[PDB]
């Protein structure tokens, strides 16, 4: 199907990005830009050996992604703007640019979704319609991250914002990533 995919990788060992001023937007490097996915995208997925972590910030890569969407979108009309976030919510954050950035996503019509680690709240292998907590996995960083993503998502949608978070363990036996894409019938 005629689509376009663009991937942002934040927290690598190099800061090459369309906008990066100082320690703001540090260690943000896009892998492959807005492209029809050929096998080179899968080659770049298989060239992902390093975590290579010097993490700076993550609530700014969304601003970079929307700005490269605005820069590239000239005549290429997209009916929707879907942005996924993949993290485990264990590093620290920056609560300054949250209200204005939520207002800009409200005025630019972005559909965002969030993917979560193993611990939402015997052999917990991959997914078996089972539990989520190994014994108890949440610390204060997961507490603050889970509550800010819950409040951001309920202010973005409502009740379904609480439903617009999904765990890695049960998203393999569902297609919750395949929502709000296909033109209906």
């Amino acid at each position: 199907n005629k689509d376009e995919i663009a991937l942002v990788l934040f927290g690598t060992d190099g800061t090459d990005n369309p906008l990066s001023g100082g320690d703001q937007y540090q260690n943000i490097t896009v892998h492959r830009h807005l492209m029809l996915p050929d096998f080179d995208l899968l080659e770049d997925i298989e060239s992902k050996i390093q975590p290579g972590s010097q993490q700076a910030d993550f609530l700014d890569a969304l601003i970079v992604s929307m700005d490269v969407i605005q820069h590239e979108t000239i005549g290429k009309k997209f009916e929707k703007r879907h942005i996924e976030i993949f993290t485990d919510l264990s590093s620290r954050f920056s609560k300054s640019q949250l209200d204005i950035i939520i207002h800009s996503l409200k005025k630019c019509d972005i559909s965002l979704q969030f993917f979560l680690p193993f611990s939402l709240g015997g052999p917990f292998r991959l997914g078996g319609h089972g539990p989520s907590f190994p014994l108890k996995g949440i610390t204060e960083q997961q507490k603050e991250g889970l509550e800010i993503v819950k409040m951001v998502m309920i202010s973005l949608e409502g009740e379904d914002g609480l439903d617009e978070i999904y765990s890695f363990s049960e998203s393999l036996r569902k297609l919750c990533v395949f929502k709000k894409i296909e033109r209906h019938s």
Partner: protein, 490 residues
Amino acid sequence: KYSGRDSLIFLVDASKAMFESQSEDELTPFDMSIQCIQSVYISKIISSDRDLLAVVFYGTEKDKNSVNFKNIYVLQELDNPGAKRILELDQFKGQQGQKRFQDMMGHGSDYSLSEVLWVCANLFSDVQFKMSHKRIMLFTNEDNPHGNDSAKASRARTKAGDLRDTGIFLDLMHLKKPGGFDISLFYRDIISSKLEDLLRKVRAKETRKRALSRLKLKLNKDIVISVGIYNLVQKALKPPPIKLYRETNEPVKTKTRTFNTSTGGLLLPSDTKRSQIYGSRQIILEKEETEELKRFDDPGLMLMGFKPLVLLKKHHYLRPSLFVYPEESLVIGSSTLFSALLIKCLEKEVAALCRYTPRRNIPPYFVALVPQEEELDDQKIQVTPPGFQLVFLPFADDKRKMPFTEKIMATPEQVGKMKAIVEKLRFTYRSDSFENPVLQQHFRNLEALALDLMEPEQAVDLTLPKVEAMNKRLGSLVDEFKELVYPPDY
């Protein structure tokens, strides 16, 4: 049995008066009986085309059979229904066909008795096949053929019981002396009226009983039980177009080849591969690789736990539901476990869940087993046999997505008027009889081509409504319900 065919001998009485018009000007019984025999052949040549059918007349002037009796004459012999045989049979219509019958063999002689049934027995005997049902249809009007002798009466009532001893069943289709049943006589020895069933109702049907799969159900890993997975509805369609030569009208026997690699010569399946193309790159696999990459299991029914009969809606289905039955052929004693499981699931209204793989290599499919209990009465209404129904289920890319976003309610006045409308249009649905129009038109088209009764009968569209009757049955409230809330109003 399964390869067991069934037979029918049509015995026709033409002694003295049925060849006559019986002092009437309405309907003659001889042409009536020939109409009924031709109708039975026409129905069964497209309904059940492997059975055995024959015609015999008795009481005629001539005589021809295998043992040379007197006044017994046959016309066809025990075989399949044939177009040549009905085009031979239909010559006896009207008074002109009656006189043609008179010059062909002549009506009127001393009709004998039970040795005609002896000739029917000799027709039933010498056939090298398997026979399931043996019935004799007797077309006659005389209800006392022994007006002068007791010896032929005794030999009739003895030979009929002798044919009953080896299982032969005759059933006379009674004629009428004034037009209705009035000859209330005492055949309470020979036999074990209504001829519209021989006329009308078997224009489209087929005959079979098979099993479609014999599988095993695995409860844990090690406690398995044999079941057979029968079918109940199968969407019957028209027989295939046999290829034929234009001039001589024989089968063609086409043959296929693959060749021409810019060398001429020939090719072979070992010299070729399968491939797919994705933008630029092509991927090359083999036929065995294509066959192998769809594999998940071995064929069977894996148990996966029990479920209450609420969550599965009947809105969810994907295929004509099958019907599983237990049998004591593979594993001895499975009827016990199936009857016990059926009784427990029947009292506690719980359905089973299974993973289902039909044959030796098919990716798996989730099925749900729902039990059902039997019914019968004095008329033997076996409409429900006991056993489990296999409701299919979708997975994720069968339930599509609708636009879903429109909502405006309605005012509480129209619901009672529509209740009145549907209560005026309220009747029983059916038990049967909603026949296929395109298949039925093809059936009648194929009927009127090998007989050259040219006139192609237009098929009765039974599915169509009758708006000229339904307007008056409904009543003059159409425009009332229109201008109530939804006027056209330009």
